[PDB]
Point group: C3
């Protein structure tokens, strides 16, 4: 029975015995066990005393309120298998390292305040790359379940990881730095026969790992199974105390790092210039790791930065406000030497970005199997969404009021895919995939200079309004870029008092005949469905099939007399030779409804367009139906398309 | 009695026994008695020693639980069955977590609210110093006009009307924002906001701003309100969880039951969960049974609200975004940015999933309504978007808009066995993209817009019904393209409603599969003069006798084929004929221009045989002997 | 105050009295109360002592570190209303049963290691079927909110459950075993009038329950409200210790069973043959139950198996590696007698499967309202996704490198629905719905022998490349299967140096006229857009409307002279009679642009195609526009389609 009113009196007591019941009162109070066994002092769970150590008695988590200082918290978390609840406002004076099979959980009032004296990292989860590699014993193609090495070359242990690499270049995108391939894999099976060890992997290989590329494998040091529950890093008012940090949570060679909720604030001043490298959360070479629900304010660089061979990474439900990019998959500069790894299998879902200084959601020029689902960007100073790697897919994403494009690719980038994406009031365009093609499926763009900028690919379905120049702008980033075929099919791009339907950019070498336009609603554009600029000679039009140009005077029945009838209808065309124009006329579909013996072959001729001044009346436009038989008295149904 | 012991000292270790037992510290410093963590004793107080959460089993009474939670910064685990006798208020930075057996049973003496999370509107407003357009990051006020503290909130409003929908009450705009930066220069304070403004806030609309006192960062883990059998004990409540001026309120799982008797009449206002002027707040996984009004009610300027994974059974609406009656004076705020995802509703007395006539950026994703007494889904604000939602067995429409409501958007939504229609957007247009409706009177009722893709079957009247709610509603252009609307022994493909003034020439029909309807692809009623048909391009009407090769002899060939047409003058009919595409396959010197004539249709007496229908290919050159490919479309 | 240093000392003490304050120091330590009331000994929370029992005093969860042995853990969880945190490595020697209103939660080091001596089940959550049934008093149609029974036949308590069944057969799929219908429902209201009890249900009925099918109802015993937080069953290295199990988590007649995260490993050796029945998680007759986040390695049977009348089941975010199927909805063999129940309302979302020995994601031939959303299968030894019940829906799913088909139905199975699904490098096909039709909407298949195999239905939109035989293969599983109409519309199926656009399989009786092809991009295929085999007489072609076959020489303007003009253009056709070929020609759309008095009806003739060897030159192809008027001098716009 030993009770102490304060810590100093408890730890000075010389007579502790192993059988004593020991109690401390006050803010870090609790019950303790005396031992002579060497114990790791942290002044929270273990205290030094004369003749031994006091160990706090507890089950379940430890609490930050038990600790005398930050240094002790660091000591405690330097071991694996820790569960610490941050129930106090901690003042960091160093990085907090978290080790495997550990949980750091915050109560609603728990905080880590970074050091105002020195900008540094706050939480680190730090493995490392192998120091030594061994060659594969044989080529391992993409899809391989097993890799092979010489028997005894590598100590592969089931449940631990391998890091594979070769000189093959990352292939997700343009890869201008020439980053080389790597992947992290878990060992799940081992067998040895004929001097070769076959190592079965959790997941299959996503490139060919060939001996001609010096394919090799080593054992990384991973930090696995770390859970960060509601991390609260910094606090509002930080800027008045000059209290910043560099990277909030930095992970390297982590597996199953899961970050839930929390708020990370203030590694730059509010609204201030970007600061290179100062991301809130950084996943470098991390596998099966996620961020879900976290909020970000006033961040110098990226909210969530994903790089190296980070694989099966997901970001859900984040809110990022005043950051450079909310999410950015990154490249690695090879200016000072080789680098390995591109992200593989990335999901961003239900994320929100406001007032990003650069793209809301971003990739650089490497990365594979990147998907954004139901994300939204508001008021970006650049694009809402930027793809710089090939074939990035966007499902039901939305971009509002980007200063440039709602959604864009960039120089050298191939065929982003936009499905049911919606773009509102972005200044330049809704979708800009004029760099290297795009697939724009059932998308909408409203309130831009042009709805879609595109050099090739497909615009299928969707709906476009309030675009001042045109709904679709067939153009390029630069004239040197190749135009490819463009299908525009099933698109609603009606006249609403704003721009034209389609703008063909002769200035950069657009050939309109590489465009095909079928079954589009172009109602109301009249003679001004197309805009053309920069043509030296009148170009040939796109192929056009069964588009709608008018909604009145577009179907009826005429009765031939002596093989002819004149029909008033909104038939349309241009027969001039002006360089920035097309020569074209309506497709008038004719079907015979009575069957006299004088039935002949039918044609449209004598297209006349009323040119009353001041303003033309298109209901007095007309065409003639003429029969090859001069006695024809057939009733003929007529239908007017573009 | 521990609370009677006269000679307590600060030095003591103290122990209570029993169901609320534990270790205690004596103190003289002032403390709020709750008879669970703080007890009054002679000359001072006993404070329970603990780390981590408090437990309801520590408390002598409900009133003590209420006192405990009346402060912020509380974590309480409900590990017992609590009997309420008053409202439980929850304050900022607090968590209320329920164990497997913990419950709050409502007050049986007074039907009242169970949980309240209530911030307050500003007590004073100041005018904006300058116009702030939609998209503004910063607002301005006169220097000294108010004190904007970083991390706290502002409430903006003006006389501009909410613009998400028809807004028949004339609710005015408001939004809640967080202050993230402040600077003052030249007599003007510039306040940087977390999120940008979603309306123009103009001096001419008396745009103004004030400081609300928000309740922020509240987590309700598995709330269990009431229990089965409540009705035998006549034990009800009014609103289960009512929140107003809350930020980051997150409700996870739990079960809320019984503010009406099972299957009983609805009761105005008795929603299970109500979010009024809440920002960044969510309901995920909660189950609802026997609710007099809405499962989750969302109103005021609630912004970035989400409801995921709920199950609601025997409620008025599972989710309803609400208006505010202005009968007694001005009101402000419409919901902005709402997501309902993976929610399920059964046996709703009104629409399964609902909005009233305001609200912006409202999305339902993979929600399902079963056996609604009204619609599965009802949109009363403009441009509500539905992604992969499903409606089964609604008594009226699977999905519907309503009077004056513009263009809901349905993407890959599926409607099964709804009595009246799958989709009813006949009030003000709709966009029906790759949807399906099966088992109704009409698959889609629509006055204008687009039906693109999708598949329709088992609709007794027609797959598509071109009609209006009332004759005074404007018909607009309608595109029907790429739709599978085949004959399956039930209704026709498209019904044109002459009674309400439908002009079929405003409809365009391209590349649809109308196989099997024969002469009965269209239904018409209410016409007194034969209307002109829609434009029609390359639709499929028959699957047999629809392609071949003919050889002209002396400029002509008679071809047996399923060519079709109507050439009569009956008011409720169209004059039309097949589009027969002709292509020449051999190239004699006598090649001339080709045409279709002499369309003849078999009239065999029990049942006509359309394989004996025919047409003639005739050339302008009477010697033409060309081989000619023919293809029959509608 | 009674204080003890060790447990043996404490439980041997002969003189305990109810008023004693009792403390155990050290291991499994804490505070205790003595009682004479019969208590269930578990050597963790309850200990036998002379004259009665010691009960541990605590609030919040129990901990496995309190218990002397596994047997005690089992005893503790044998009662309902338990919260146990597994904070130690437990060695199982028996099945752990979990009862209602209970939570079993694992810390990062907590584990249950199965018994190496005997393969058995690890966790069981086991209710039971009714012991007695009563007939319904009246027919209850699908959609019924209420069922009726004779007053007094059964006592239906609000908040408890009912189990309904009849002799009607399950109707979700082919149901070759003749499994009969059942459902589980919760009672929410009861009233009795005129000798009839009306029972109001939580959810409506999904079949017609008829007296003529012997419709009946009984009270099952359910295990309700069980939460398993991060279950860790077995560990890597298990195979070196021959340490396996049968079923990891087996549930029957459970409601609101929610399993979160965790890892289940090793009921077979890594890469070994499948073992029938050894699923990781099994939900039989479970309602409102979910698996979210769990990882699976080296499983003999299914990752998550769903069977019986399991209703409103969801599987989210799982990773399954080296299993038979990641998810499988199952039938029930009726070889030894009747069985009841098919799954109803199933969602699989954001799940990943690697190296499955059979289909990645599977159903058997029953089940209703089954949906997979954003799931991905890699490197399956069979299909990526297999549907054996009717109308399974797939949204944005992906299949890579399946040994057979990315996505497939099977014998007798109707119309799976694929929306925006993507298939890469699957050996045989991307989509194989040739057994009973399919709906293939905006899908993509790349790197297969054929992109889509299909006998009827719709291929609408989407994009197909790098398919060695053809992009679309119109075929059947067996000749006896009915061909139905097939619509191919809006599909990008261009020539890229690989296969043809569409292959018509005459061998199995395909009539190409049942196929219609509109507005497809077939650019580059030339005369080789179709493959045909097995025809003995030349078949008639599909209907074709406004497809794209060439990208150059496809639009221009000709000027007639004396009623004719020769036009150089990439017009195409075949006029031969070879059995495995079509007779066809380009659709050339002609529109008049000038209107001379000599305007006549216009036609295409004299199609001429260059046949240079080795390489034909399509820039030398031509056709003639001829007018019915011999003096016609019209300018005529021409456009070349297929
Ligand atoms: C590992 C590393 O070098 O990280 C990069 C980081 O990704 C970032 O790279 C930028 C990239 O975002 C940009 O788009 O392209 C540039 C190349 O053209 C590239 O430089 O920023 C640089 C500075 C690196 O960031 C540093 O990384 C780490 C770390 O621990 O991983 C610490 C450094 O701290 C600061 C803030 C710093 O010391 O300046 O930058 C961090
Ligand atoms: C919602 C549903 O149960 O639909 C039933 C539909 O009502 C109909 O029921 C039949 C009824 O016509 C017949 O007379 O009695 C039968 C036996 O009791 C009864 O089954 O048809 C069946 C096939 C159901 O319709 C299918 O149901 C569902 C579903 O989720 O329940 C989806 C199917 O999609 C289609 C359109 C299809 O593709 O065939 O049919 C739906
Ligand atoms: C309840 C039951 O009988 O379960 C089946 C299980 O679903 C599985 O059935 C297979 C099915 O997967 C396959 O596709 O079709 C087969 C019929 O053709 C069918 O047999 O496997 C069988 C063996 C049953 O599994 C057993 O179920 C249970 C249980 O508790 O539910 C325990 C048994 O343990 C083993 C591993 C065993 O004893 O072998 O199998 C389990």
């Amino acid at each position: 029975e030993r009770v102490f009113s304060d810590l100093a009196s408890m730890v000075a007591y010389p007579n502790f015995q192993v059988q004593d019941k020991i109690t401390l009162l006050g803010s870090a109070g609790g019950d303790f066990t005396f031992t002579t066994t060497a114990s790791v002092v942290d002044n929270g769970t273990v205290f030094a005393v004369p003749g031994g150590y006091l160990l706090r008695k507890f089950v379940g988590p430890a609490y930050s309120s038990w600790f005398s200082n930050w240094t002790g918290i660091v000591t405690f978390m330097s071991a694996p298998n820790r569960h610490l609840v941050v129930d106090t406002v901690l003042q960091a004076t160093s990085v907090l390292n978290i080790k495997s099979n550990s949980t750091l959980e915050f109560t609603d009032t728990g905080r880590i305040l970074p050091d105002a004296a020195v900008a540094r990292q706050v939480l680190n989860i730090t493995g490392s790359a192998p120091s030594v590699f061994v060659p594969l014993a044989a080529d391992a193609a993409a899809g391989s379940k097993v890799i092979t090495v010489a028997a005894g070359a590598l100590s592969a242990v089931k449940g631990t990881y391998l890091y594979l690499r070769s000189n093959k270049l990352c292939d997700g995108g343009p890869n201008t730095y020439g980053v080389k391939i790597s992947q992290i894999r878990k060992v799940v099976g081992v067998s040895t026969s004929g001097g070769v060890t076959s190592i079965r992997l959790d997941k299959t290989l996503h490139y060919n790992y060939y001996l001609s590329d010096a394919a090799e494998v080593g054992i990384p040091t991973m930090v696995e199974n770390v859970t960060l529950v509601s991390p609260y890093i910094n606090e509002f008012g930080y800027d008045d105390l000059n209290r910043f940090f560099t990277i909030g949570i930095s992970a390297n060679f982590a597996a199953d790092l899961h970050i839930q909720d929390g708020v990370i604030i203030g590694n730059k001043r509010p609204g201030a210039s970007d600061i290179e490298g100062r991301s809130a959360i950084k996943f470098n070479n991390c596998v099966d790791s996620t961020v879900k629900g976290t909020c970000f304010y006033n961040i110098g660089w990226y909210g969530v930065e994903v790089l190296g061979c980070s694989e099966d990474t997901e970001v859900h439900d984040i809110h990022a406000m005043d950051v450079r990019h909310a999410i950015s998959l990154n490249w690695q500069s090879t200016a000072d030497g080789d680098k390995w790894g591109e992200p593989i299998e990335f999901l961003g879902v239900n994320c929100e970005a406001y007032s990003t200084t650069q793209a809301g959601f971003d990739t650089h020029d490497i990365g594979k199997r990147v998907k954004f689902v139901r994300c939204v960007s508001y008021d970006s100073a650049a694009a809402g969404f930027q793809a710089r790697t090939n074939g990035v897919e966007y499902l039901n994403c939305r971009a509002y009021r980007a200063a440039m494009d709602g959604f864009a690719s960039n120089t050298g980038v191939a065929f982003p895919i936009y499905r049911e994406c919606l773009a509102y009031d972005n200044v330049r365009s809704g979708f800009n995939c004029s760099y290297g093609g795009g697939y724009v499926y059932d998308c909408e763009a409203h309130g831009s200079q042009n709805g879609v900028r595109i050099n090739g690919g497909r615009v299928k379905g969707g709906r476009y309004t309030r675009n001042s120049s045109s709904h679709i702008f067939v153009t390029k980033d630069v004239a040197e870029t190749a135009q490819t075929s463009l299908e525009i099919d099933g698109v609603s791009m009606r006249y609403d008092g704003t721009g034209r339907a389609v703008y063909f950019h002769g200035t950069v070498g657009i050939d309109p005949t590489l465009v095909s336009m079928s079954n589009n609603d172009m109602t109301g554009h009249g003679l001004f469905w197309a805009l053309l600029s920069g043509y030296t000679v009148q170009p040939t039009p796109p192929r056009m099939s069964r588009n709608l140009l008018d909604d009145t005077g577009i179907r009826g029945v005429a009765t031939l007399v002596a093989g002819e009838a004149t029909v008033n209808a909104r038939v349309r065309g241009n027969f001039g030779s002006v360089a920035n124009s097309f020569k074209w006329v309506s497709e008038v579909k004719l079907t015979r409804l009575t069957f006299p013996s004088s039935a002949g072959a039918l044609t449209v001729t004598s297209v006349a367009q009323n040119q009353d001044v001041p303003t033309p009346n298109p209901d007095l436009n007309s065409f003639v139906i003429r029969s090859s038989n001069a006695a024809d008295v057939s009733q003929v149904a007529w239908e007017v398309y573009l």
